[PDB]
Ligand binder design. Structure first.
Ligand SMILES: CCCCCCCCCCCCCCCCCC(=O)OC[C@H](COP(=O)(O)O)OC(=O)CCCCCCCCCCCCCCCCC
Ligand SMILES: CCCCCCCCCCCCCCCCCC(=O)OC[C@H](COP(=O)(O)O)OC(=O)CCCCCCCCCCCCCCCCC
Ligand code: NA
Lengths: 533, 134, 133
């Protein structure tokens, strides 16, 4: 089962013997044999070499150029290119999947890709390879984007061919040049809207374990495209949303500040303006709470993410949902003739007020500041509170055990007294009912020294990580966050209107191999070159 | 079992030390283990080199201040040492006694002590990060 | 006389280069393969699997390399950096992940339970005078 399915053609190909391969081919053996052995499986056991399951793919992925040309250019029985294996991957898909982000590997892969593509175009110009999809509905470009292959994506996006009868395979062109300045064009077909899955959509919604989510948006066209969309309309949409949220929060605060103090709600309103205003404010607050609840549940339903990504990703959708839950529980308690609705309301109010850092994205420096804040919260709280809590509990138990009786004979009181030392209110003489004063003093001094050493170690370790390798990541994270916001806003059409669109229609190549012309929704960029004439 | 009362002191020392003796199990977790390693290295490499100067300064200024005072509650050495130690944790008084002469000398001594101690703490935290060049 | 072989002597005195060379020695000549310690079971395309000899590394019945490196005194030059050699890191990771993890977790749980019991017992001591009670 492990070596099952192998055929002589595979050995001949993978031994680097051209003459033996030719002699074996002369016999007439089938060139469409597929090996289903477990040794060629995806990740079934660490050992294995996936190569597409076809002899043509084997030749392509093993540095074989003359051999693959011979296989594809024989008069006896040429091998079809549109072949698909059990998984459905083609030679192009296998080439994409073999890449592992190494400079030599990247140059090899791109050279082989270009050669095979031009040969395929030359032999059968009528057919197009890049639009063939496997079972998962992924094209080579989508597959490259999903798995974080920087080199292949970068090569494909700005591909340039400078040969007659092959211009129509290119994606980057040159509209005109004059002196030190020339303007280029980039093809946007299947980048922002493909009707199945675009590059931007795949990169934005990918799970966090993907290798290079942050750094994959630095490729040329994407940055400018996102900036254009933003500056056209996302700015106005975002500012309107921010204003509305601020107004709602102000109303909620003002309504909560004037609650009545009589006992056992509900309270019967009186014939005065203040009562009407207060009731209106409360109604508005409840409406906002239910709105946020429904939006959050809708998002959680559509995305359906995993568990480990619920805090690394969606770090804000959970907070808004929790605030809404607090509001609803407060309402339920209020209409049940109890008094804990006040506690629920204050928790909701504080959390909502602190939940306003979400809107700092859209401003560069503030966004970077917020990114650093959240990274530190998620990366240091757990690692630095454990030791402190251990020390506090141990010394508090010792001190409480020493005392005989009095007001400080509990555990809560002594824990609070020892916590006071960390914020600059230590007493050192907060009780006198005990024996062996020397033990008391020694314990307190040891606790103080250990805590201060611990704080010093925490601030040195915290700056150690920043070797200047903290800002370049923060900027990329902020850019990814803004990109997600732009995509979401575009998907949620403003009102019922629809004006957004990538760029203008244009004629660049003129004519395909067929007589008919074509249009490909380009996006012009102006650049000035002084050297390398 | 000898009908005494110091077993309480022994028991509390044992309890506190045992509770703090639990950092041994942080090995087996990568980041926590590295944190504990840094903690122990700092304890063994800075305590002796940084407490000597502070204790010297504290004792000298405490002896001077005690010698200045005439009589009262703060006419001992333990009391004045504790009062001057309070300054380091944010509870300085600057007027904790009034039974003496030559108030200017008292104020000058206290100000000099405060300035020297703060300079010393600053130097300690700069020297401590200097060693970490990554 | 001290019962040290060249490998043990190299490990004890902190000679990184000699130890690194000896551990992964490779000979590619006929009639001399049996002197090697690293081999090649098979190769296929861009992938090939190697083998490492573990005789007298983790159990020699007198003194192994791991035992000598672990218990060496602190004045030895390169105790910390001598475990970065190839086979040793993976060997230690394997042993850990097989069974030391479970042993360690059980020990941690037992210690926590004992400490909780001791704290609770000490918190409720009687206050009458002149023990025993
Ligand atoms: C960026 C990070 C932002 C974080 C800022 C969040 C600030 C708000 C912190 C509040 C988090 C909630 C903590 C859990 C509160 C439970 C308190 C409780 O026991 O009930 C209080 C109180 C009940 O306590 P009781 O009077 O003893 O019964 O009210 C409730 O019933 C809680 C309702 C839930
Ligand atoms: C990582 C570092 C962890 C360090 C944390 C350790 C925290 C515990 C610190 C205690 C260290 C022991 C210091 C010496 C204690 C002697 C105190 C003494 O004079 O006897 C008290 C007291 C006797 O004092 P007395 O009432 O004047 O006679 O009890 C004893 O008899 C001590 C028993 C030994
Ligand atoms: Na203070």
């Amino acid at each position: 089962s492990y070596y099952k399915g192998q055929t002589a053609l595979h050995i001949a190909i993978e031994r680097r013997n051209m003459t033996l391969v030719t002699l074996l081919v002369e016999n007439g053996a089938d060139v469409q044999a597929a090996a289903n052995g477990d040794f060629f499986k995806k990740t079934k056991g660490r050992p294995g070499f996936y190569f597409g399951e076809l002899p043509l793919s084997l030749a392509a992925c093993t540095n074989q150029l003359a051999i693959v040309k011979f296989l594809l250019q024989n008069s006896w029985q040429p091998a079809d290119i549109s072949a698909r294996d059990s998984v459905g991957n083609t030679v192009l898909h296998a080439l994409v999947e073999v890449a592992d982000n190494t400079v030599d590997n990247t140059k090899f892969v791109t050279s082989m890709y270009n050669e095979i593509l031009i040969l395929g175009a030359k032999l059968h110009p009528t057919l197009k390879l890049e639009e063939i999809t496997n079972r998962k509905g992924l094209t080579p470009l989508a597959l490259a984007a999903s798995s974080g292959k920087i080199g292949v994506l970068a090569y494909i996006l700005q591909r340039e061919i400078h040969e007659p009868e092959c211009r129509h395979l290119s994606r980057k062109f040159t509209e005109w040049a004059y002196g030190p300045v020339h303007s280029s064009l980039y093809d946007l077909s299947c980048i922002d809207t493909c009707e199945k899955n675009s590059v931007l959509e795949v990169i934005a919604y990918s799970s966090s374990e993907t290798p290079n989510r942050h750094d994959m948006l630095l490729v040329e066209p994407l940055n400018r495209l996102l900036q254009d969309k933003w500056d056209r309309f996302v700015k106005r949409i975002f500012y309107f949303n921010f204003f509305v949220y601020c107004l709602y929060m102000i109303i909620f605060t003002a309504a909560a500040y004037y609650r009545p103090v009589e006992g056992l709600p509900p309270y019967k309103l009186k014939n005065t303006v203040g009562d009407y205003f207060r009731v209106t404010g409360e109604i508005l607050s409840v409406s906002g709470g239910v709105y946020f609840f429904f939006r959050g549940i809708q998002y959680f339903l559509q995305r359906r993410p995993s568990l480990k990504s619920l805090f690394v990703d969606s770090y804000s959708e959970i907070l808004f949902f929790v605030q809404s839950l607090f509001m609803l529980v407060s309402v339920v308690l209020y209409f049940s003739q109890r008094k804990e609705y006040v506690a629920s309301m204050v928790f909701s109010l504080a959390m909502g007020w602190t939940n306003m850092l979400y809107y700092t994205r859209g401003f560069q420096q503030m966004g970077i500041y917020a990114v650093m804040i959240e990274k530190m919260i998620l990366r240091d709280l757990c690692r630095f509170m454990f030791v402190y809590l251990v020390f506090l509990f141990g010394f508090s138990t010792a001190v409480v055990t020493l005392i005989e009786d009095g007001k400080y004979n509990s555990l809560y009181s002594t824990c609070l007294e020892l916590f006071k030392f960390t914020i600059g209110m230590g007493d050192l003489e907060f009780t006198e009912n005990y024996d062996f004063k020397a033990v008391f003093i020694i314990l307190l001094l040891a606790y103080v020294i250990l805590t201060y050493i611990l704080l010093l170690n925490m601030l040195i370790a915290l700056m150690g990580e920043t070797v200047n390798k903290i800002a370049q990541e923060s900027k990329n994270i902020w850019k990814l966050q803004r990109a997600i916001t732009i995509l979401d806003t575009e998907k949620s059409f403003l009102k019922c209107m629809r004006k957004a669109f990538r760029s203008g229609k244009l004629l660049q190549v003129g004519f395909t191999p067929d007589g008919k012309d074509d249009y490909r929704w380009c996006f012009r960029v102006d650049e000035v070159n002084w050297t390398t004439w």
